[PDB]
Ligand binder design. Sequence first.
Ligand SMILES: [Ca+2]
Ligand SMILES: [Ca+2]
Ligand SMILES: [Ca+2]
Ligand SMILES: [Ca+2]
Ligand SMILES: [Ca+2]
Ligand SMILES: [Ca+2]
Ligand SMILES: [Ca+2]
Ligand SMILES: [Ca+2]
Ligand SMILES: [Cl-]
Ligand SMILES: [Cl-]
Lengths: 236, 236, 5, 5
Amino acid sequence: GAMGSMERASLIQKAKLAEQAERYEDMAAFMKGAVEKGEELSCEERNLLSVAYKNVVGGQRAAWRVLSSIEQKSNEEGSEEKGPEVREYREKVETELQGVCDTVLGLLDSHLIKEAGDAESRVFYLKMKGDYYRYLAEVATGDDKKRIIDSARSAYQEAMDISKKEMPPTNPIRLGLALNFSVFHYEIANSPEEAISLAKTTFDEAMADLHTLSEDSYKDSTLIMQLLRDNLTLWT
Amino acid sequence: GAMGSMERASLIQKAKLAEQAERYEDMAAFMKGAVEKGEELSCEERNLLSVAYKNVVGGQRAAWRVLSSIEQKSNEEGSEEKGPEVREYREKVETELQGVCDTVLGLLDSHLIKEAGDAESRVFYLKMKGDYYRYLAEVATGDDKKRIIDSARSAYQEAMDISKKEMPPTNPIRLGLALNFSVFHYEIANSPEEAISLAKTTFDEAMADLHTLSEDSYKDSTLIMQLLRDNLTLWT
Amino acid sequence: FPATV
Amino acid sequence: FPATV
Ligand SMILES: [Ca+2]
Ligand SMILES: [Ca+2]
Ligand SMILES: [Ca+2]
Ligand SMILES: [Ca+2]
Ligand SMILES: [Ca+2]
Ligand SMILES: [Ca+2]
Ligand SMILES: [Ca+2]
Ligand SMILES: [Ca+2]
Ligand SMILES: [Cl-]
Ligand SMILES: [Cl-]
């Protein structure tokens, strides 16, 4: 580990600087270093980890989609042969993306999830596991596609089960988990009805619990509820 | 060179794909590979090279500015001591930026400039030399700052001399050169009057030659003329 | 593309 | 910051 010689607190400090500078690859490397110190992460630190990798993989996914669209067009009737370059470069980006996913999944397996006992941490990490398997599924085309999809499903489902038992329906982690699992259903699992049912039930159960919340908690929850509504509007 | 085994045409093709995918680090690496094939670059290829590195260094410069501002605030009276981390990370970004500048300057010196005989190529490359020395000057604080500034000045001045002899006053390369040299004067050389004089003379001489142009050339030239006007408005 | 967090 | 190209 290139970050092995840097203090944990310094890695966290620098991750926050990297975020301010929109240097998300650096941010992710600092946070990977912090995880590899072996101590559990605080709430703030978990969110630094997720922001960093979300931004890195988000850029890769966007690039992959551009290149995949170009590649698809190249394989239409009437398209002139341009050689192996589009496929090669799409493959390059794909391999980089898979590498980032494998890095995140590796951190979760060694050893964030096994040490996470509180619902807020455990659900957070299992949601991340589902998310990064979902990103692997987006680019999968081979013999392991079904197993990758099932890995995402299994992680999300464990997170859902804990969240329903241990968290209020307005909890932002619970809401975000449901949002993303709903998208998994729609986009990955070919289950649009399940996606819609989950988003609607999640929204409605949160609505009914808003009365319990402070002004600041209400703002946090209603933000994510609006994302559920946005997806429902897209899908209906 | 990691790109040594890839065909020149494939590197160019992939640079164009990387641009579409907003993968500017990849784009720059492909174009560096293409330059290192040893052949001269076409107009289109020169512009691919410049776009790639402009985007890479532009991101680094933006990050450097964020971190420098944080560092400056940390050295104000009343600011709590936070340790060496801000300086260290600013230095990290700075070193990366200097590395990209040195890479570009290296390509220009080995051997793009010496083989560039036409005004359009030679001015383009000398403008680039001035630009990347200017970026080095932005972060310079030591004993070589004066020499870095003089290197930028010298490159810009050679480009200006050729452009005035060999190009019409509306030529976009000539206009962009003048725009950037004017900014050098204002921001680097502590010469705001020279900056303003250059921008105004450039604008006025271009205005007088627009009548010679096609509709499409007029659009190209007037776009850059508006940037000169924008700077003049900022500075007066 | 749908919203995720 | 001023415009450059
Ligand atoms: Ca320590
Ligand atoms: Ca044809
Ligand atoms: Ca592949
Ligand atoms: Ca139905
Ligand atoms: Ca060849
Ligand atoms: Ca104090
Ligand atoms: Ca330095
Ligand atoms: Ca004056
Ligand atoms: Cl490639
Ligand atoms: Cl550092």
